[PDB]
Ligand binder design. Sequence first.
Ligand code: 718
Ligand code: SAL
Ligand code: CL
Ligand code: CL
Lengths: 252, 1053
Amino acid sequence: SLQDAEWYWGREEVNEKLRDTADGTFLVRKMHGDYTLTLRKGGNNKLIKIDGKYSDPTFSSVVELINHYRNESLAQYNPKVKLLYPVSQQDQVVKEDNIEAVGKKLHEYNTQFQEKSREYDRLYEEYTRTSQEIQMKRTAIEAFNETIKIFEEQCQTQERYSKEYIEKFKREGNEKEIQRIMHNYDKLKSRISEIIDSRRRLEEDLKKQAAEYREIDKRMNSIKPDLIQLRKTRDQYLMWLTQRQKKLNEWL
Amino acid sequence: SYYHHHHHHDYDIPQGAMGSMPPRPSSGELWGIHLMPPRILVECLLPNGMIVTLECLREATLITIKHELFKEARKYPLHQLLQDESSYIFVSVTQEAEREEFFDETRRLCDLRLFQPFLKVIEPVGNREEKILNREIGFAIGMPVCEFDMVKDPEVQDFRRNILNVCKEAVDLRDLNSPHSRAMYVYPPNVESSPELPKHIYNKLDKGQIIVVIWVIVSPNNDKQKYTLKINHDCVPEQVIAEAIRKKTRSMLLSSEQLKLCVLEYQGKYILKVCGCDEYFLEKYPLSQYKYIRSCIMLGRMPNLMLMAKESLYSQLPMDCFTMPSYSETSTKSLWVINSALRIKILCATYVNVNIRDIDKIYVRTGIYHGGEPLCDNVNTQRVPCSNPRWNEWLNYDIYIPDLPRAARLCLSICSVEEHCPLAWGNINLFDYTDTLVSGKMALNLWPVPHGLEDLLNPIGVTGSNPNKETPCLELEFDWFSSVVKFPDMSVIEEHANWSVSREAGFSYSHAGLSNRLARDNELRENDKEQLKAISTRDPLSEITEQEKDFLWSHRHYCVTIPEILPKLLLSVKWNSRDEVAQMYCLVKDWPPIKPEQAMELLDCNYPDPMVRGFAVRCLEKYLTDDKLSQYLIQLVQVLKYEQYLDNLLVRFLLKKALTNQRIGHFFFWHLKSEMHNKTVSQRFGLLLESYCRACGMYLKHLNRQVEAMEKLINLTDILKQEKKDETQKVQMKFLVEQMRRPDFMDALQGFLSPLNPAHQLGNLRLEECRIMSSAKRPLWLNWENPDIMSELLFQNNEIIFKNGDDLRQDMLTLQIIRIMENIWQNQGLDLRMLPYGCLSIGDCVGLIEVVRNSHTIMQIQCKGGLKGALQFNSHTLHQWLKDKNKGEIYDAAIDLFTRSCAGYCVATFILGIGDRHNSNIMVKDDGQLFHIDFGHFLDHKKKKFGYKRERVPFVLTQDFLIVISKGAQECTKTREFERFQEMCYKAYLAIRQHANLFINLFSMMLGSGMPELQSFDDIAYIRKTLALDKTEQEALEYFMKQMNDAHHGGWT
Ligand SMILES: O=C1CCCc2cc(O)ccc21
Ligand SMILES: O=C(O)c1ccccc1O
Ligand SMILES: [Cl-]
Ligand SMILES: [Cl-]
């Protein structure tokens, strides 16, 4: 029973069992002392150290000491929470006492998991490209707008000088002068028209991009929670077995 | 029967197939097109309002285009309204959306980075032409300097103005004993840290001497003359210059006395070059202490220096000429007065992208942090879930406002529902850069959850809002206290500590939870003074228990006797007790300085306090040599990410060193420049690079050329990888060469410095030897003429691989780690020859790798020495191939090299857990040295699927190796040759284990970078198991053997 204990395992693989459990969860474990109560508190793991007795204050065993503190908080021993979650995997593995078929399930889930992790990786690249493609679209839009200003300024710039050079000399040249001045001006203004149409066409593309971007995040967020549970089940199935370390790798 | 006739209905076959080349995209010469058409139309907007459209060549200078434009404008109307062309400049909108004036008219149309092909003509405004070579700066930087000027944020504006303190100081150190000190900046002496010599180096010298070759030139600039000295290893450049001049000027027409007088007038006119590259010996170190010499000694080479006129050197250094840029509440209410708890109002997230089918409900998780958390983590209620989420509730944190430490940070995250799962995240500094506790309303645009993080909250992640607008923006509101609350002065904190100390001295006889206070007196117990140093020796990842914490805290004053404990002590302080923290501030104020390798831990994410991080920087300022800095420069640039504010001490340290030593400066630029795409650091690194670029002198113009070269190669490969995919090598290679022959590429890719090493110049391109390798990433093999005077004496050709496509920074780090393992081994006498070939990321999956000449992948060895028919390759062929190279006594030495390198690369590899080794990623040089390439993922990142105590052996020595190792026997397992080998591996394994603190800390400091292999400290924790740090060293040896045995199946006991 002190070997079994429903949580006595006997550093790194503690933390990867304490990874993503709640505020309260715990377990028990080099000439430092003996066993170590690794209790998790809000994303950070707190390690508490342990003639018969198991710092200053009569508890006759390791199981004696932890049952007391499952009821009670740890503030009275050391100033700054309870041992509420004694989390330690026969509950939902199809209860399979078929040693081989639990090993096959591990592969099925691990192929699903590894399938799923690629889908999540692919999409994260699409997301990040799409951010970059979007901000490149945005900058271009400013570039366009700034381009347009220079041409809007240019068509304005000539109106000042061209219509100084119509009135000063109306008879001289006349429709030889002012035709071939007007031609240029009508190039300049429909050119502006093409540019503005080019910008518009990018903005419509930007929205369709920003929409696709939204759709990628959406599906990332719908893949994520499955990727956790599919992962977490695999680690419980793989824990139940080790209750053949080299046999695992072909399934995995 | 194969598939039970089960149909996959969705599956349809109209980048898994051809699984290579992932990172994109990048636009080149004109908007939306990589390379502009060879002949192109540009509208020129004239000052008379006319548009004349020239057809120009792609490659044409603006001088040519202006000259033609003002010919061609004549034919259009209103010509008499134009000035002489010399009264004008070209302007246009670029791809960065700024209107650049084109001052340098020798620039070519393709090189301007135009957005649209058009050019407006103007008379030059901003009459300081000089000043508007900020274009130079934002070329080198890759974003225009005008983009900083319109940042509202006062912190930024404050960084820019206040950082100039540092620049002006460094520029002063340069022009101090000029011209010598300018030369000293530009050409700082490339030198080992220790003047002491390892045993095995010394013993190549016959009683401490070296034959050397000094070379000289007389008239015109052709004939050269050797002067083959045999000086003492530990004699300085000035002494060596004498002996060259002595022998040069001995004569039958000069007496002995007459010679001595002709020496002295000559002796200090000259300085020593390294023939073949721009390295120099400008200060009194032992010759042996310069790296070139010590290399020459190890490689069995006669050093080839050059006698160089100081004036022909001081000729080449132009003046640096620094210029200051254009950009030059009544005592408030102390934090300790505020009598309340912290509460933060969450309000409303806007832009949350969730399937309402898939996800039930969503909330905002929160916490206060300092690396770790100073209170119970709390969420809010699961309200208005998914559809338009809005909570207008004050979150209530059990911590008093005065117990918030200076470096306190809020960390929050929107989550989904034990269905718990993060959507977004973002953190805020509770104090601003002016020490001001944060109050009022805040907009915080959030980050997406990265790969490795399944956790809910992510507090190591960067402080600040995401610059990307279209992302989950969760706005919120901080309490207001009718006053700008501010963090206490040090004077004020000192007093509170001096008081808290006295107050402990009157606490009485009994205290349950002695824990936090001694109750010992000045006499401590000897069993405990032993338990403390015991703690101190442990690595950073051997987490400390609450007993040990309280214990360390109680004996904090004895901990000053053992300075090296500080990292541990600091992590035992309760940062939520200003009583405890204030006292720690007084310790750290005059805590004994420690070794840089130990102080560097204190700039990782677990030590965010300014005072701590100060101490660290003060350690570096004392001990850390310009040598040892540039080794660890990668980790120090990374570690900036964990600084709370733009302006800080670490930034001011590095920036200064960079402006003091052009060799640091060089890599400092590139490492920052590298990460400029990454928006976590864009602003910060941009701002910094602007400082450096503004103050670094002529090197800016050199950098700008290196930068222009890389951009061309980035474009060239981007085309090869898109639209010239699905073409034969033949067609691609024809495209490559066609392009490299165009004058713009010829201009841009020829006269410059290798970014891998700016000592090497790159001259003309030998295109006959330039080629695209067979990889699907389409890397370029480029080759340059070494345009040194003494090319021949070093290498006539310089070749480096440019690779657009792979993230070079994992490799870069493993190679750096190897660099360090070699050094550790060698400098503690034992010779294992690693070959950390050069690597450098200069971009987002863009980089440069050093070519090692005369080396081959085992696979080539076997493909070459492989008999016809193709039944099986022979294990002996490696050995036969190696025999074929090294014949006679030379053979015996080549096997010692193979054996020495193979043991180093066995241990390094096993420890690091790099990708499985095989014939196409292991290489052997003609002289018999072995070295790995393309390491893959470094800390066992393929254990992220399955994994679990795999503790793999990536270098498994097949027969091939074993044959060679035991000269040529059969049953190689049973030779002294192999006994010797094994004992190298065991001495190497233990050597790295004794420096394991460092290696943890180098990895700890690299968590910053978004490397998927380094997401959190558990990643780094592999290196614990492999080094077996929890065990004793005698167990560790046995562990390592056990591991080495089972992967080989027999041999190791
Ligand atoms: O290409 C140039 C321009 C002038 C200065 C210079 C000095 C060198 O040592 C080598 C090359 C060069
Ligand atoms: O997660 C932890 O174990 C931890 C706890 C406190 C401080 C730093 C840490 O990495
Ligand atoms: Cl480097
Ligand atoms: Cl190589």
